[PDB]
From a paper:
The 14-3-3σ protein, which has multiple interacting partners with specific peptidic motifs, was used as a case study. We have observed this phenomenon first-hand with human 14-3-3σ, a protein which has several hundred known interacting partners in the cell. Furthermore, different isoforms of the 14-3-3 protein are function-specific. For example, the 14-3-3σ isoform (but not other isoforms) specifically targets p53 and is associated with tumour suppression, making it invaluable to determine crystal structures of the target peptide with the correct isoform.
To address this problem, we present a combined co-crystallization and peptide-soaking approach to obtain crystals for any 14-3-3σ–peptide complex that may exhibit difficulties when crystallizing under our optimized ‘sigma’ conditions. The second step involves, after these 14-3-3σ–cJun-pS227 crystals are fully grown, displacement of the c-Jun peptide via addition of the desired peptide for the final structure at high concentration to the crystal drop and incubation for a period of time until full occupancy of the peptide is achieved. We have found useful criteria to be using the peptide at >95% purity and performing the soaking at 277 K with an incubation time of one week. To demonstrate the experimental reliability of the method, we considered this approach for peptides found in the PDB where co-crystal structures were published with isoforms of 14-3-3 other than the sigma isoform, since they were not able to crystallize under the standard ‘sigma’ conditions or any of the other hundreds of screening conditions tested. Not only does this significantly reduce the production time, but new 14-3-3–peptide structures that were previously not accessible with the 14-3-3σ isoform, despite screening hundreds of other different conditions, were now also able to be resolved. The new strategy that we present here has allowed the determination of several new structures of 14-3-3σ which had not previously been possible, illustrating the ease and success of the method. All models were determined to belong to the orthorhombic space group C2221 using Zanuda. In addition, the method retains the robust, stable, high-resolution and well diffracting features of crystals originally grown in the sigma screen.
Author numbering:
A (entry chain P), D (entry chain P): 98 to 102
B (entry chain A), C (entry chain A): -4 to 71, 73 to 99, 101 to 231
The structure:
């Protein structure tokens, strides 16, 4: 959710 | 490997079909086969590799988090239910660790042949990411070494990206975003996470004027993810 | 089987954990293990079996439809791209057929031991459903026989449900819904599909007055699905 | 989409 998705 | 008899080009074509069909396990197997042909990967092919394994490990991580949360609740006034929750969490954990260990592909031999900044930063960021996923489930004597492997990979990628890429480069931005998440979620360093996200955002902002309309959209998309995290963390 | 060493109760517990984790392949393997213990399944256990395999085969069917659509487009002014689309569609098709063939569990030996209407109708509807999924991809000399196997299973389930269950019974309603879809999508019988859906809806409507609030919600939910199909088809 | 889901 916080990292590159 | 089971893909040893299939043409490299056919593996790439089928990876793209598997993506359209949302068959990400197949997609990953195809791209693993393509990597094992021994040739370097193009930009598009690197993205196919990353998309495939990110989706596979993303499902495993989501399931591990559900099961870990149930396991933690069972270990409180809780009623004993036997070894089953731990056993099944362990099963999912082992499969997750196996996928991270496979993504081996970077060490044999993608990184050592990657000389251009765009390929080398991409692979080193991947190496950081998959050590970070190993760190998320690590509890043993190697947890510190796993964390340092993630940190070391991210740091080398960062050093190259700052020297060789403009501050708006989407690979550079996504690396900074993920290294910032590593600091926040893994390394117990929220201040470093916030500092990195803020400096990355500001330096990209100052470079947007150099970009075409399409590059501007690419860069501002990832800048928004940095801002979203900063908003959450501050 | 790989689940032969695990306790029946542990398999059921892990099937429920797998459902919470959205690990439907695991869920299906656990429930297959539970069925192979040889004991009859409770109502809740029958639902776990159905949920697991419906999700697994649902993903396969969705992927088969994507790949089949691409294959059809390639067979028009289209540029030849080689055998890869057909090969990969065939791969997904074979895996789908394997899962339908596994759901074997009904024949060895769930159906022959199912004596109560709720269990027997449930399994015969399942048998119709998985022959219907085989029919969706069938193109060969056995397509007619596959269709008739689906029809025969649905018909026996229908006969039992009309004799032994009230018209609002959710299993009876879901059977009628799916047999109506079989008529529309597989058997080239839209008029039979519409007639069955309408009569099922009307007879359920007339029986709602006998129901508790919770049973009323259960029955009207499936009645709405009948109405949704009728709205589409008329 | 049409069958019981
Ligand atoms: Ca070749
Ligand atoms: Ca036992
Ligand atoms: Mg091969
Ligand atoms: Mg090179
Ligand atoms: Mg076993
Ligand atoms: Mg019996």
């Amino acid at each position: 959710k916080l990292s590159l998705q | 490997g089971a893909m040893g008899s299939m043409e490299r080009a056919s593996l790439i074509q089928k990876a793209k079909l598997a993506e359209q069909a949302e068959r990400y396990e197949d997609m990953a197997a195809f791209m693993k086969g393509a990597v094992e042909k021994g040739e370097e990967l193009s930009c598009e092919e690197r993205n196919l590799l990353s998309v495939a394994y990110k989706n596979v490990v993303g499902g495993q991580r989501a399931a591990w988090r559900v099961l870990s949360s149930i396991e933690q609740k069972s270990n409180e006034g809780s009623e004993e239910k036997g070894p089953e929750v731990r056993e099944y969490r362990e099963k999912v954990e082992t499969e997750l660790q196996g996928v991270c260990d496979t993504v081996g592909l970077l060490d044999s031999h993608l990184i050592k042949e990657a000389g251009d900044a765009e390929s080398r930063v991409f692979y080193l960021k991947m190496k950081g990411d998959y050590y970070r996923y190993l760190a998320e489930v690590a509890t043993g004597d190697d947890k510190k070494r796993i964390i340092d492997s993630a940190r070391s990979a991210y740091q080398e990628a960062m050093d190259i990206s700052k020297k060789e890429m403009p501050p708006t480069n989407p690979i550079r931005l996504g690396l900074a975003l993920n290294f910032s998440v590593f600091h926040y979620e893994i390394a117990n360093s929220p201040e470093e996470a916030i500092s990195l996200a803020k400096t990355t955002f500001d330096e990209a902002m100052a470079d947007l004027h150099t970009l075409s309309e399409d590059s501007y959209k690419d860069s501002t998309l990832i800048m928004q993810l940095l801002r979203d995290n900063l908003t959450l963390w501050t």
